[PDB]
Amino acid sequence: RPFKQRRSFADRCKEVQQIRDQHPSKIPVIIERYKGEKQLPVLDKTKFLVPDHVNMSELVKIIRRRLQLNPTQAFFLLVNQHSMVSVSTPIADIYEQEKDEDGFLYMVYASQ
Numbered sequence: 001r002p003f004k005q006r007r008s009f010a011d012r013c014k015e016v017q018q019i020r021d022q023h024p025s026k027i028p029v030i031i032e033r034y035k036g037e038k039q040l041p042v043l044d045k046t047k048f049l050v051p052d053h054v055n056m057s058e059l060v061k062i063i064r065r066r067l068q069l070n071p072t073q074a075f076f077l078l079v080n081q082h083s084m085v086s087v088s089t090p091i092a093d094i095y096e097q098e099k100d101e102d103g104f105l106y107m108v109y110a111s112q
Contacts, residue, residue: 003030003046009102016103019049027052027095027105031063031077034110040067040075050091057087063109075111082108 007015019028026049033042043066050059060077069075079085080098091105099105 003032003106012102012104015047020103023049025052026050027091028103029059029091029105029107031059031107031109034076034078034108037110039111040109043067052092052095053090055088055090056085056094059091059107060087067109073111075109077107077109079105079107 004012016028019026029048029050030046031043031048032046033040043063045066048059048062056077063077064073064075067073067075076084079094080100083098085094085098095105
């Protein structure tokens, strides 16, 4: 089930804050599969802490690994309102610019 439907807005704020208060150098990112995707698998992990010094290329690289992709597989990692951000764009720039009302940063992966 979608993370937003698995935890109440109340619950979610609280996690984000607990993350802030316990791991202040990490960005809280929720990563999930695009709703209408077929050719790419559901991952066991949806909650990701991402070192705030990195950029989008790092994330694209972690998700490849977890999805067990091969170089050939081009995929899209889209933030928030299906936005494409530069892979050079640092996640901390991305976070401030695109984070949800609940403190998390939501992304989805897709292909084609």
